[PDB]
């Protein structure tokens, strides 16, 4: 399960074409504008086409695409240990069924205007990649893309100072559900406050333990 990466920039036809760990990925995007060094914002019908081995190409049409020519593609797991990078297009099995899914840097609705993502799970029945609202939504106001551990997904939020929120989601059948929210408040370093909420009887409840 070794992680592999690659970088690329949109050529004169607004095109990239790469093979990352045996999965071919192409990008077709015109009329992009430079957002910051090495990074183009493409929001005029950008297309990300993914061809898994032995399969028909699948075209994704994200609402926008941030193409970082210095960190373009990543193929590997979302380890809390391993992945502290930000990539434009990520191939990774989020739901543990043995087939890679796709994560695309599509917005900047993360915490303090950081990256937010569109998540697409491979749907084995349909032979396609299906946009996942619940998973994409985790990245909104998050400090970055979530990490995956078994069927558990972790994400952090907060005010970038003294309030930190640590979320744990359980993923069952294309559906991410929040099961735990840990809020730590260190505004008074001498009096740190910790709040634990957990999913109980179908609702998030504050708990002592």
Q: Which residues bind Ca ion (CB under 5 A)?
A: 93, 95, 97, 99, 101, 122
Given a contact cutoff of 8 angstroms between Cβ atoms, the answer to whether 206 and 196 are in contact is yes
For Ca ion, the closer of residues 29 and 121 by Cβ is 121
Do residues 60 and 22 touch, judged by C-beta distance below 8 A?
no
Smallest separation (angstroms) from Ca ion to the CB of 189: 43
Nearest approach in angstroms of CB 92 to Ca ion is: 8
From CA 75, how far away is CA 81, in angstroms rounded?
A: 15
Using the minimum distance from each CB to Ca ion, give the nearer residue, 93 or 197: 93
Q: Give CA separation, 46 vs 65, 92, 100, 192, in Å.
A: 7, 21, 21, 46
Min CB(173)–Ca ion separation in Å: 12
Instruction: Select 156 or 174, whichever has its Cβ closest to Ca ion.
Output: 174
Which segments of 76-207 are extended strands (E)?
Answer: 89-92, 101-107, 116-123, 128-131, 147-149, 152-158, 163-171, 176-185, 193-200, 203-207
- 112 DSSP assignment: G
Q: To the nearest whole angstrom, how small is the minimum distance from the Cβ of residue 100 to Ca ion?
A: 6
Minimum Å distance from CB 176 to Ca ion?
13
Q: Minimal distance in Å, beta carbon 7 to Ca ion?
A: 25
The CA-based diameter of the chain, rounded to the nearest angstrom, is 59
Give the nearer residue to Ca ion in terms of CB position, either 95 or 136. 95
- Whether 6 contacts 72, CB under 8 Å: yes
Instruction: Considering the complex, state which of residue 22 and residue 160 has its C-beta at the smaller distance from Ca ion.
Output: 22
Q: Please identify, using beta-carbon distances, which residue of 8 and 78 lies nearer to Ca ion.
A: 78
Cα separation of 45 and 31, whole Å? 10
């Amino acid at each position: 399960k070794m992680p592999s990466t690659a970088n690329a920039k949109l050529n004169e036809q607004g095109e990239i074409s790469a093979d990352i760990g045996g999965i071919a990925v192409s990008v077709h995007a015109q009329s992009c504008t430079e957002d910051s060094p090495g990074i183009m914002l493409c929001n005029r019908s950008p297309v990300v086409e993914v061809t898994f081995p032995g399969a028909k190409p699948i075209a994704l049409e994200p609402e926008a695409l941030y193409v970082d020519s210095n960190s373009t593609f990543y193929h590997g797991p979302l380890d809390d240990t391993y992945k502290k990078n930000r990539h434009s297009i990520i191939l990774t099995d989020i739901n543990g069924d043995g087939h890679e899914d796709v994560v695309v840097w599509s917005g900047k609705e993360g915490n303090y205007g950081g990256p937010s993502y569109s998540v697409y799970l491979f749907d084995a029945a349909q032979k396609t990649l299906v946009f996942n609202q619940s998973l994409s939504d985790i990245t909104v106001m998050a400090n970055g893309l979530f990490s995956v551990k078994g069927n558990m997904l972790t994400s952090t939020s907060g005010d970038g100072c003294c309030i930190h929120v640590f979320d744990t989601y359980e993923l069952k059948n294309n559906e991410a559900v929040l099961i735990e929210r840990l809020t730590e408040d260190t505004n008074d370093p001498a009096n740190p406050k910790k709040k634990i909420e957990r999913l109980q009887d179908g609702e998030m409840k504050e708990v002592s333990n």
